[PDB]
């Protein structure tokens, strides 16, 4: 009634809707998890270098879990710049560089973009366009020593402040005033680097803190460092949403006989649509079939005779949806009948429906006519002894309604 925009419906079959199976679940497949990164070598080292001349470790060609860098009790503070702490486990990078150093507990605020003062302007300058993470922890149990640890130095003097990441190692005497250095200190001639001298009795502002900055890069080059190959169990003989190595689709997956060559991953149909895939965790081939769909047609004797209807799910098997499987599709609400009649309402593939016996929609194989063996022989003839004058009506269209449209008044007006 709504499809026809009418409260009265004539006898017929009408398409009212489209049926569609929907994915029952989602699956993901990637290859077996392999080549995990040795990130433990960055954080568990015996000592680091001086913050004026920090030490760099390279990580490449591997996969990792980064969530440990804040879920571990080992790290007193964690930050990320241009990156989110959860999103690390989904991201990828060309290389990872760990910049490693020690500073006193007051100073950790300096390891941030656009900072000013001694660490930022003389030791480790961070720009706005940086991409990476900062891992910081108290190390008074590791780096402090009796009589004071002098292995850690910081720059205090320079001719001008650092550019972004300017690792200036130079040790020459800064001339603050009248005394020329000649390779040594004097009145207002001073050595540009200062010792921390870390001792275990220090207060929390003067205790050593270890820092690692994970200085990431992405180039014009591809990635080499990534999150893990997140995967599910496999599903077969049901409509699912799927992902194989990043190839995504929806369909019914099933085992197949198709013999791919050892390097081939995906199969395509003559119209370039994907028709098969390899499971990356067990190298057998699956056919893909589309998730089932078709027209929905309503069969009615018309509202002037009944509110009863049958419904045809065109091309659908009744498995997907009285109930009866025709070759036109699954037919619901019609009685199958073993008689045959003239076609009342056509369903397709030799099937028709009518409203009959106290009454219901019935479905039957249509009848082409009564059979007749003609009484033929080599010497028998039939001759008509009488006639009927017959008058027959033929109706033919001759004209349409003549129409005119002003294209400017239709479009504009």
């Amino acid at each position: 009634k709504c499809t026809l925009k009418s409260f009265t419906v004539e006898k017929g079959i009408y398409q009212t809707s489209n049926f569609r199976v929907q994915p029952t679940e989602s699956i993901v497949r990637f290859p077996n998890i392999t080549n995990l990164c040795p990130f433990g070598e960055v954080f568990n080292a015996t000592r680091f270098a001086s913050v004026y001349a920090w030490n760099r470790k390279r990580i490449s060609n591997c996969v990792a879990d980064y969530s440990v860098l804040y879920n571990s009790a080992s790290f007193s503070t964690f930050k990320c710049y241009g990156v989110s702490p959860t999103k690390l486990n989904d991201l990828c990078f060309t290389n990872v560089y760990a910049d490693s150093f020690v500073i006193r507990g007051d100073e950790v605020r300096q390891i941030a973009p656009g900072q000013t003062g001694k660490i930022a302007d003389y030791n480790y300058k961070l720009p706005d366009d940086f991409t990476g993470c900062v891992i910081a922890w108290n190390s008074n149990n590791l780096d402090s020593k009796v009589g004071g640890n002098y292995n850690y130095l910081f720059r205090l003097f320079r001719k001008s402040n650092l550019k972004p990441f300017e690792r200036d190692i130079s040790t020459e005497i800064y001339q603050a005033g009248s005394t020329p250095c000649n390779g040594v200190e004097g009145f207002n001639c001073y050595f540009p680097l200062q010792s921390y001298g870390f001792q275990p009795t220090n207060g929390v502002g003067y205790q050593p803190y270890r820092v690692v900055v994970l200085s990431f890069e992405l180039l014009h080059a591809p990635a080499t460092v990534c999150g893990p190959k997140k995967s599910t169990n496999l599903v077969k003989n049901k409509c699912v949403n799927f992902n194989f190595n990043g190839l995504t689709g929806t369909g019914v997956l099933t085992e197949s006989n198709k013999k791919f060559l050892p390097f081939q991953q995906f199969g395509r149909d003559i119209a370039d649509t994907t028709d098969a895939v390899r499971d990356p965790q067990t190298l057998e081939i699956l056919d893909i079939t589309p998730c089932s769909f078709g027209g929905v047609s309503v069969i009615t004797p018309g509202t002037n005779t009944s509110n009863q209807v049958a419904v045809l799910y065109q091309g659908v098997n009744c498995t997907e949806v009285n109930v009866f499987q025709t070759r036109a599709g699954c037919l619901i609400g019609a009685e199958h009948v073993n008689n045959s009649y003239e076609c009342d309402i056509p369903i397709g593939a030799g099937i028709c429906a009518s409203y009959q016996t106290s009454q219901s929609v019935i479905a039957y194989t249509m009848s082409l006519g009564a059979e007749n063996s003609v009484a033929y022989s080599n010497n028998s003839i039939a001759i008509p002894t009488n006639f009927t004058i017959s008058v027959t009506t033929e109706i033919l269209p001759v004209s349409m309604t003549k129409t005119s449209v002003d294209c400017t008044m239709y479009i504009c007006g």
Binding site: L219, H220, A221, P222, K258, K259, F263, Q264, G267, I270
Partner: protein
């Protein structure tokens, strides 16, 4: 010297199975019946990519170098069949300027009687290698016939090339050019014939 390439130098263009079908594809291919340059070891141009092949029985050829300068100055590819297995590194190599094998680094990887055939190309920071090996009867030239080259490696090196040279009894070099090909896939998903669509008016038909 030079020799006719015939219908050789076709490779599988992508990681996709296709079967009983004719597929039209546009890519860098060696044009049909073009000349290869023939050698019995200079530095050579790479252009858009290279077809390389050798009639062999001596096993004299062992590897290649590819890069912009092929020098200690900058990152370049070294590829060697190191008797046990294939070995690859990307480095600024300090070896002799006419390099040979006896009768920093950014990346590393580990894997007449016959014709050995290879295709090399570089696209958006990936280095592609394809190959095939076959028995032969002809001595002086590439044998007139068909067999498609299958991929070996797809290395994410991020580094570019303009020249190459071979490390080491006779071998052939041709250049890939942007071409349209029609490729014939059989029931078992192998490429079994091809048409170079620009070769002549019948091929265009």
């Amino acid at each position: 010297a030079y020799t006719n390439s015939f219908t050789r130098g076709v490779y599988y263009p992508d990681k996709v199975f296709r079967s009983s079908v004719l597929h039209s594809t546009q890519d860098l291919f060696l044009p049909f019946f073009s000349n290869v340059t023939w050698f019995h070891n200079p530095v050579l141009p790479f252009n858009d990519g290279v077809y390389f092949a050798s009639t062999e029985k001596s096993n004299i050829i062992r590897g290649w170098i590819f890069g912009t300068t092929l020098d200690s100055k900058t990152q370049s590819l070294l590829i060697v069949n190191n008797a046990t297995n294939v070995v690859i590194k990307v480095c600024e190599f300090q070896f002799c300027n006419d390099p040979f094998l006896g009768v920093n680094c950014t990346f590393e990887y580990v894997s007449f009687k016959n014709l050995r055939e290879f295709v090399f190309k570089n696209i958006d920071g990936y280095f592609k290698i394809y190959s095939k090996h076959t028995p032969i009867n002809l001595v002086r030239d590439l044998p007139q016939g068909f067999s498609a080259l299958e991929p070996l490696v797809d290395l994410p090196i991020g580094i570019n090339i303009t020249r190459f040279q071979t490390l080491l009894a006779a071998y052939y070099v041709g250049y890939l050019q942007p071409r349209t090909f029609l490729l014939k896939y059989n029931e078992n998903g192998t490429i079994t014939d091809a048409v170079d669509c620009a070769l002549d008016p019948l091929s265009e038909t």
